[PDB]
Amino acid sequence: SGAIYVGNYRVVNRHLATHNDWANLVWEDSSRDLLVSSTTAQGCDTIARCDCQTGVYYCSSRRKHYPVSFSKPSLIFVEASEYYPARYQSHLMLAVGHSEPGDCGGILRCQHGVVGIVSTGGNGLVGFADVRDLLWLDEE
Ligand SMILES: NC(=O)C[C@@H]1CCCN(c2ncnc3ccccc23)C1
Ligand SMILES: [Zn+2]
């Protein structure tokens, strides 16, 4: 589990969104595994606006933050899950790293701020849903 709290937005994996998230929905995109809901309190996270390919992510199944090199956001194949049919997830970045399903929501960050959240993984791969192109998270 995990979320990004930026301004009056809460960014979570769409597959982990709560009823309160759907009842206060701002935007959602199944192809990206992302959902954004509105919050009453202002958040402290800042979004990175960059093309970094190195950063650090949080892995809840190890209680550890790991430095990783990651690919550029792309259209990748993801295995069938009870959350998604096997399919093409967009804006996804891959790195070598431990992941379990519960780890989704962990933040990946670089020197500029939050880059994305754990979204996929398996066999020593971890995938991250990028949020750096969502410029509207910084306003309104
Ligand atoms: N965006 C998606 O397709 C959601 C899937 C749902 C099922 C779990 N998926 C995984 N995520 C992270 N780490 C993992 C480690 C081992 C196995 C699976 C995963 C993410
Ligand atoms: Zn950066």
Curated annotation (Swiss-Prot):
Superkingdom of source: Viruses
Cited function: Cysteine protease that cleaves viral polyprotein and specific host proteins. It is responsible for the autocatalytic cleavage between the P1 and P2 regions, which is the first cleavage occurring in the polyprotein. Also cleaves the host translation initiation factor EIF4G1, in order to shut down the capped cellular mRNA translation. Inhibits the host nucleus-cytoplasm protein and RNA trafficking by cleaving host members of the nuclear pores. Counteracts stress granule formation probably by antagonizing its assembly or promoting its dissassembly.
Reactions the enzyme catalyzes: Selective cleavage of Tyr-|-Gly bond in the picornavirus polyprotein
Name of the molecule in the record: Protease 2A
Active site, per annotation: H15 (for protease 2a activity), D33 (for protease 2a activity), C104 (for protease 2a activity)
Organism: Coxsackievirus A16 (strain G-10)
Residues that hold Zn(2+) 1 according to the record: C50, C52, C110, H112
Subunit structure: Homodimer.
